[PDB]
PDB file of all heavy atoms in Angstrom:
ATOM      1  N   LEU I 591      14.952-179.470 -90.042  1.00 10.21           N
ATOM      2  CA  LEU I 591      14.891-178.457 -91.090  1.00 10.21           C
ATOM      3  C   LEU I 591      13.925-177.341 -90.720  1.00 10.21           C
ATOM      4  O   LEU I 591      12.807-177.597 -90.260  1.00 10.21           O
ATOM      5  CB  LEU I 591      14.476-179.066 -92.431  1.00 10.21           C
ATOM      6  CG  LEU I 591      15.495-179.935 -93.167  1.00 10.21           C
ATOM      7  CD1 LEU I 591      14.840-180.593 -94.370  1.00 10.21           C
ATOM      8  CD2 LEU I 591      16.698-179.110 -93.592  1.00 10.21           C
ATOM      9  N   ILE I 592      14.371-176.109 -90.929  1.00 10.01           N
ATOM     10  CA  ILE I 592      13.612-174.892 -90.681  1.00 10.01           C
ATOM     11  C   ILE I 592      13.609-174.104 -91.984  1.00 10.01           C
ATOM     12  O   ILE I 592      14.601-174.122 -92.720  1.00 10.01           O
ATOM     13  CB  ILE I 592      14.226-174.052 -89.534  1.00 10.01           C
ATOM     14  CG1 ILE I 592      14.504-174.901 -88.292  1.00 10.01           C
ATOM     15  CG2 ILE I 592      13.315-172.884 -89.160  1.00 10.01           C
ATOM     16  CD1 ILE I 592      13.272-175.430 -87.625  1.00 10.01           C
ATOM     17  N   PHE I 593      12.503-173.427 -92.286  1.00  9.56           N
ATOM     18  CA  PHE I 593      12.493-172.464 -93.389  1.00  9.56           C
ATOM     19  C   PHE I 593      11.968-171.133 -92.861  1.00  9.56           C
ATOM     20  O   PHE I 593      10.759-170.965 -92.663  1.00  9.56           O
ATOM     21  CB  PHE I 593      11.655-172.962 -94.568  1.00  9.56           C
ATOM     22  CG  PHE I 593      11.566-171.974 -95.707  1.00  9.56           C
ATOM     23  CD1 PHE I 593      12.712-171.406 -96.244  1.00  9.56           C
ATOM     24  CD2 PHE I 593      10.337-171.616 -96.242  1.00  9.56           C
ATOM     25  CE1 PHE I 593      12.637-170.489 -97.282  1.00  9.56           C
ATOM     26  CE2 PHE I 593      10.257-170.708 -97.287  1.00  9.56           C
ATOM     27  CZ  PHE I 593      11.410-170.143 -97.805  1.00  9.56           C
ATOM     28  N   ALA I 594      12.894-170.189 -92.665  1.00  6.61           N
ATOM     29  CA  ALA I 594      12.575-168.812 -92.296  1.00  6.61           C
ATOM     30  C   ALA I 594      11.648-168.777 -91.084  1.00  6.61           C
ATOM     31  O   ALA I 594      10.626-168.091 -91.073  1.00  6.61           O
ATOM     32  CB  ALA I 594      11.982-168.047 -93.475  1.00  6.61           C
ATOM     33  N   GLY I 595      12.018-169.531 -90.053  1.00  5.39           N
ATOM     34  CA  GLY I 595      11.244-169.603 -88.827  1.00  5.39           C
ATOM     35  C   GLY I 595      10.041-170.525 -88.843  1.00  5.39           C
ATOM     36  O   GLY I 595       9.293-170.548 -87.858  1.00  5.39           O
ATOM     37  N   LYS I 596       9.848-171.315 -89.900  1.00  6.86           N
ATOM     38  CA  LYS I 596       8.815-172.345 -89.943  1.00  6.86           C
ATOM     39  C   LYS I 596       9.505-173.698 -89.906  1.00  6.86           C
ATOM     40  O   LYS I 596      10.344-173.988 -90.766  1.00  6.86           O
ATOM     41  CB  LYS I 596       7.976-172.259 -91.221  1.00  6.86           C
ATOM     42  CG  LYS I 596       6.908-171.198 -91.275  1.00  6.86           C
ATOM     43  CD  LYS I 596       5.615-171.831 -91.796  1.00  6.86           C
ATOM     44  CE  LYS I 596       4.594-170.773 -92.189  1.00  6.86           C
ATOM     45  NZ  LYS I 596       3.286-171.345 -92.563  1.00  6.86           N
ATOM     46  N   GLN I 597       9.111-174.547 -88.965  1.00  7.16           N
ATOM     47  CA  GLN I 597       9.710-175.870 -88.856  1.00  7.16           C
ATOM     48  C   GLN I 597       8.930-176.856 -89.727  1.00  7.16           C
ATOM     49  O   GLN I 597       7.716-177.020 -89.562  1.00  7.16           O
ATOM     50  CB  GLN I 597       9.795-176.281 -87.384  1.00  7.16           C
ATOM     51  CG  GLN I 597      10.488-177.602 -87.104  1.00  7.16           C
ATOM     52  CD  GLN I 597      10.845-177.754 -85.631  1.00  7.16           C
ATOM     53  OE1 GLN I 597      10.937-176.762 -84.899  1.00  7.16           O
ATOM     54  NE2 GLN I 597      11.062-178.991 -85.195  1.00  7.16           N
ATOM     55  N   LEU I 598       9.638-177.492 -90.661  1.00  2.00           N
ATOM     56  CA  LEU I 598       9.084-178.365 -91.687  1.00  2.00           C
ATOM     57  C   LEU I 598       8.782-179.765 -91.145  1.00  2.00           C
ATOM     58  O   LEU I 598       9.292-180.184 -90.101  1.00  2.00           O
ATOM     59  CB  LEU I 598      10.057-178.459 -92.864  1.00  2.00           C
ATOM     60  CG  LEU I 598      10.508-177.115 -93.451  1.00  2.00           C
ATOM     61  CD1 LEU I 598      11.466-177.325 -94.617  1.00  2.00           C
ATOM     62  CD2 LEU I 598       9.325-176.252 -93.866  1.00  2.00           C
ATOM     63  N   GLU I 599       7.940-180.493 -91.885  1.00  2.00           N
ATOM     64  CA  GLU I 599       7.476-181.825 -91.508  1.00  2.00           C
ATOM     65  C   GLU I 599       7.732-182.808 -92.645  1.00  2.00           C
ATOM     66  O   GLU I 599       7.553-182.467 -93.817  1.00  2.00           O
ATOM     67  CB  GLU I 599       5.985-181.815 -91.149  1.00  2.00           C
ATOM     68  CG  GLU I 599       5.541-183.017 -90.332  1.00  2.00           C
ATOM     69  CD  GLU I 599       4.116-182.887 -89.838  1.00  2.00           C
ATOM     70  OE1 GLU I 599       3.422-181.944 -90.272  1.00  2.00           O
ATOM     71  OE2 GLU I 599       3.696-183.719 -89.006  1.00  2.00           O
ATOM     72  N   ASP I 600       8.159-184.028 -92.291  1.00  2.00           N
ATOM     73  CA  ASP I 600       8.544-185.016 -93.300  1.00  2.00           C
ATOM     74  C   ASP I 600       7.415-185.339 -94.272  1.00  2.00           C
ATOM     75  O   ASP I 600       7.680-185.729 -95.417  1.00  2.00           O
ATOM     76  CB  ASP I 600       8.997-186.316 -92.636  1.00  2.00           C
ATOM     77  CG  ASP I 600      10.275-186.167 -91.863  1.00  2.00           C
ATOM     78  OD1 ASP I 600      10.992-185.167 -92.085  1.00  2.00           O
ATOM     79  OD2 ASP I 600      10.558-187.062 -91.035  1.00  2.00           O
ATOM     80  N   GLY I 601       6.158-185.202 -93.842  1.00  2.00           N
ATOM     81  CA  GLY I 601       5.054-185.588 -94.709  1.00  2.00           C
ATOM     82  C   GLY I 601       4.812-184.612 -95.847  1.00  2.00           C
ATOM     83  O   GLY I 601       4.751-185.005 -97.015  1.00  2.00           O
ATOM     84  N   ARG I 602       4.667-183.328 -95.525  1.00  2.00           N
ATOM     85  CA  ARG I 602       4.317-182.337 -96.537  1.00  2.00           C
ATOM     86  C   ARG I 602       5.396-182.162 -97.598  1.00  2.00           C
ATOM     87  O   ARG I 602       6.455-182.793 -97.532  1.00  2.00           O
ATOM     88  CB  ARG I 602       3.966-181.010 -95.864  1.00  2.00           C
ATOM     89  CG  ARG I 602       2.648-181.094 -95.107  1.00  2.00           C
ATOM     90  CD  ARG I 602       1.513-181.254 -96.121  1.00  2.00           C
ATOM     91  NE  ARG I 602       1.112-182.645 -96.338  1.00  2.00           N
ATOM     92  CZ  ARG I 602       0.399-183.065 -97.382  1.00  2.00           C
ATOM     93  NH1 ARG I 602       0.009-182.204 -98.315  1.00  2.00           N
ATOM     94  NH2 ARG I 602       0.082-184.348 -97.501  1.00  2.00           N
ATOM     95  N   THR I 603       5.129-181.309 -98.581  1.00  2.00           N
ATOM     96  CA  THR I 603       6.046-181.061 -99.680  1.00  2.00           C
ATOM     97  C   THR I 603       6.519-179.611 -99.678  1.00  2.00           C
ATOM     98  O   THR I 603       6.024-178.762 -98.929  1.00  2.00           O
ATOM     99  CB  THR I 603       5.385-181.393-101.025  1.00  2.00           C
ATOM    100  OG1 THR I 603       4.241-180.551-101.217  1.00  2.00           O
ATOM    101  CG2 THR I 603       4.948-182.853-101.053  1.00  2.00           C
ATOM    102  N   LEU I 604       7.500-179.350-100.548  1.00  2.00           N
ATOM    103  CA  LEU I 604       8.059-178.008-100.690  1.00  2.00           C
ATOM    104  C   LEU I 604       7.015-177.011-101.179  1.00  2.00           C
ATOM    105  O   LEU I 604       7.039-175.839-100.787  1.00  2.00           O
ATOM    106  CB  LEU I 604       9.253-178.042-101.644  1.00  2.00           C
ATOM    107  CG  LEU I 604      10.433-178.935-101.246  1.00  2.00           C
ATOM    108  CD1 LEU I 604      11.428-179.028-102.379  1.00  2.00           C
ATOM    109  CD2 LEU I 604      11.118-178.410 -99.995  1.00  2.00           C
ATOM    110  N   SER I 605       6.101-177.449-102.053  1.00  2.00           N
ATOM    111  CA  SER I 605       5.081-176.541-102.571  1.00  2.00           C
ATOM    112  C   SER I 605       3.987-176.260-101.551  1.00  2.00           C
ATOM    113  O   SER I 605       3.277-175.258-101.682  1.00  2.00           O
ATOM    114  CB  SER I 605       4.455-177.105-103.850  1.00  2.00           C
ATOM    115  OG  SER I 605       3.628-178.222-103.572  1.00  2.00           O
ATOM    116  N   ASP I 606       3.814-177.135-100.560  1.00  2.50           N
ATOM    117  CA  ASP I 606       2.895-176.841 -99.467  1.00  2.50           C
ATOM    118  C   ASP I 606       3.380-175.670 -98.616  1.00  2.50           C
ATOM    119  O   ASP I 606       2.562-174.899 -98.101  1.00  2.50           O
ATOM    120  CB  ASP I 606       2.692-178.092 -98.614  1.00  2.50           C
ATOM    121  CG  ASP I 606       2.012-179.214 -99.383  1.00  2.50           C
ATOM    122  OD1 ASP I 606       1.195-178.917-100.283  1.00  2.50           O
ATOM    123  OD2 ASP I 606       2.299-180.393 -99.091  1.00  2.50           O
ATOM    124  N   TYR I 607       4.695-175.518 -98.460  1.00  3.54           N
ATOM    125  CA  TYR I 607       5.284-174.438 -97.677  1.00  3.54           C
ATOM    126  C   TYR I 607       5.665-173.214 -98.514  1.00  3.54           C
ATOM    127  O   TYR I 607       6.363-172.329 -98.004  1.00  3.54           O
ATOM    128  CB  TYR I 607       6.519-174.948 -96.922  1.00  3.54           C
ATOM    129  CG  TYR I 607       6.226-176.020 -95.895  1.00  3.54           C
ATOM    130  CD1 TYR I 607       6.693-177.316 -96.062  1.00  3.54           C
ATOM    131  CD2 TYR I 607       5.495-175.731 -94.751  1.00  3.54           C
ATOM    132  CE1 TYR I 607       6.429-178.297 -95.122  1.00  3.54           C
ATOM    133  CE2 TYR I 607       5.225-176.705 -93.806  1.00  3.54           C
ATOM    134  CZ  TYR I 607       5.693-177.986 -93.994  1.00  3.54           C
ATOM    135  OH  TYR I 607       5.427-178.956 -93.049  1.00  3.54           O
ATOM    136  N   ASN I 608       5.221-173.140 -99.773  1.00  2.47           N
ATOM    137  CA  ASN I 608       5.539-172.021-100.668  1.00  2.47           C
ATOM    138  C   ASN I 608       7.048-171.809-100.811  1.00  2.47           C
ATOM    139  O   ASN I 608       7.529-170.677-100.912  1.00  2.47           O
ATOM    140  CB  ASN I 608       4.855-170.735-100.191  1.00  2.47           C
ATOM    141  CG  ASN I 608       4.665-169.719-101.302  1.00  2.47           C
ATOM    142  OD1 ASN I 608       4.654-170.065-102.483  1.00  2.47           O
ATOM    143  ND2 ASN I 608       4.525-168.452-100.925  1.00  2.47           N
ATOM    144  N   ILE I 609       7.806-172.905-100.817  1.00  2.66           N
ATOM    145  CA  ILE I 609       9.255-172.854-101.025  1.00  2.66           C
ATOM    146  C   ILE I 609       9.503-172.811-102.531  1.00  2.66           C
ATOM    147  O   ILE I 609       9.497-173.843-103.202  1.00  2.66           O
ATOM    148  CB  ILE I 609       9.974-174.029-100.360  1.00  2.66           C
ATOM    149  CG1 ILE I 609       9.781-173.973 -98.841  1.00  2.66           C
ATOM    150  CG2 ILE I 609      11.457-174.032-100.727  1.00  2.66           C
ATOM    151  CD1 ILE I 609      10.305-175.188 -98.096  1.00  2.66           C
ATOM    152  N   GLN I 610       9.718-171.613-103.066  1.00  2.00           N
ATOM    153  CA  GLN I 610       9.954-171.430-104.489  1.00  2.00           C
ATOM    154  C   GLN I 610      11.444-171.616-104.783  1.00  2.00           C
ATOM    155  O   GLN I 610      12.219-172.048-103.924  1.00  2.00           O
ATOM    156  CB  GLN I 610       9.438-170.062-104.930  1.00  2.00           C
ATOM    157  CG  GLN I 610       7.941-169.874-104.735  1.00  2.00           C
ATOM    158  CD  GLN I 610       7.461-168.516-105.203  1.00  2.00           C
ATOM    159  OE1 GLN I 610       8.257-167.599-105.394  1.00  2.00           O
ATOM    160  NE2 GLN I 610       6.153-168.381-105.392  1.00  2.00           N
ATOM    161  N   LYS I 611      11.863-171.298-106.006  1.00  2.00           N
ATOM    162  CA  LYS I 611      13.254-171.494-106.391  1.00  2.00           C
ATOM    163  C   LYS I 611      14.150-170.459-105.721  1.00  2.00           C
ATOM    164  O   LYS I 611      13.731-169.338-105.420  1.00  2.00           O
ATOM    165  CB  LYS I 611      13.422-171.424-107.914  1.00  2.00           C
ATOM    166  CG  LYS I 611      13.152-170.056-108.548  1.00  2.00           C
ATOM    167  CD  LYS I 611      13.607-170.023-110.007  1.00  2.00           C
ATOM    168  CE  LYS I 611      12.689-169.173-110.880  1.00  2.00           C
ATOM    169  NZ  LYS I 611      12.706-167.729-110.509  1.00  2.00           N
ATOM    170  N   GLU I 612      15.393-170.869-105.460  1.00  2.00           N
ATOM    171  CA  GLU I 612      16.413-170.029-104.825  1.00  2.00           C
ATOM    172  C   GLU I 612      16.025-169.611-103.403  1.00  2.00           C
ATOM    173  O   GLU I 612      16.496-168.591-102.895  1.00  2.00           O
ATOM    174  CB  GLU I 612      16.749-168.808-105.696  1.00  2.00           C
ATOM    175  CG  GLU I 612      17.433-169.163-107.033  1.00  2.00           C
ATOM    176  CD  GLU I 612      16.936-168.341-108.227  1.00  2.00           C
ATOM    177  OE1 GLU I 612      16.905-167.094-108.136  1.00  2.00           O
ATOM    178  OE2 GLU I 612      16.589-168.946-109.267  1.00  2.00           O
ATOM    179  N   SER I 613      15.168-170.397-102.749  1.00  2.00           N
ATOM    180  CA  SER I 613      14.854-170.220-101.336  1.00  2.00           C
ATOM    181  C   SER I 613      15.907-170.926-100.480  1.00  2.00           C
ATOM    182  O   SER I 613      16.646-171.790-100.959  1.00  2.00           O
ATOM    183  CB  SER I 613      13.455-170.753-101.019  1.00  2.00           C
ATOM    184  OG  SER I 613      12.449-169.832-101.409  1.00  2.00           O
ATOM    185  N   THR I 614      15.960-170.570 -99.194  1.00  2.00           N
ATOM    186  CA  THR I 614      17.010-171.064 -98.302  1.00  2.00           C
ATOM    187  C   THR I 614      16.421-171.727 -97.060  1.00  2.00           C
ATOM    188  O   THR I 614      15.777-171.059 -96.242  1.00  2.00           O
ATOM    189  CB  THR I 614      17.956-169.930 -97.885  1.00  2.00           C
ATOM    190  OG1 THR I 614      18.448-169.257 -99.051  1.00  2.00           O
ATOM    191  CG2 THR I 614      19.135-170.484 -97.082  1.00  2.00           C
ATOM    192  N   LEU I 615      16.653-173.038 -96.919  1.00  2.73           N
ATOM    193  CA  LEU I 615      16.364-173.770 -95.691  1.00  2.73           C
ATOM    194  C   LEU I 615      17.557-173.728 -94.736  1.00  2.73           C
ATOM    195  O   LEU I 615      18.713-173.614 -95.154  1.00  2.73           O
ATOM    196  CB  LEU I 615      16.005-175.230 -95.977  1.00  2.73           C
ATOM    197  CG  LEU I 615      15.009-175.605 -97.070  1.00  2.73           C
ATOM    198  CD1 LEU I 615      14.789-177.116 -97.028  1.00  2.73           C
ATOM    199  CD2 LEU I 615      13.692-174.856 -96.914  1.00  2.73           C
TER     200      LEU I 615
END
């Protein structure tokens, strides 16, 4: 999983990456 050029990690959460509503992974 990538969010806008940031590669996500299984440990952290959506709010740690500032993934608000209607965002696109």
Side-chain angles (χ1 to χ4, degrees):
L591 287 172
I592 310 294
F593 178 51
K596 282 227 193 186
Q597 184 165 339
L598 307 180
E599 199 172 9
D600 293 343
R602 290 292 96 197
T603 62
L604 300 171
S605 71
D606 296 329
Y607 296 113
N608 203 22
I609 297 173
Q610 298 181 343
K611 66 169 145 65
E612 294 139 51
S613 281
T614 307
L615 313 184

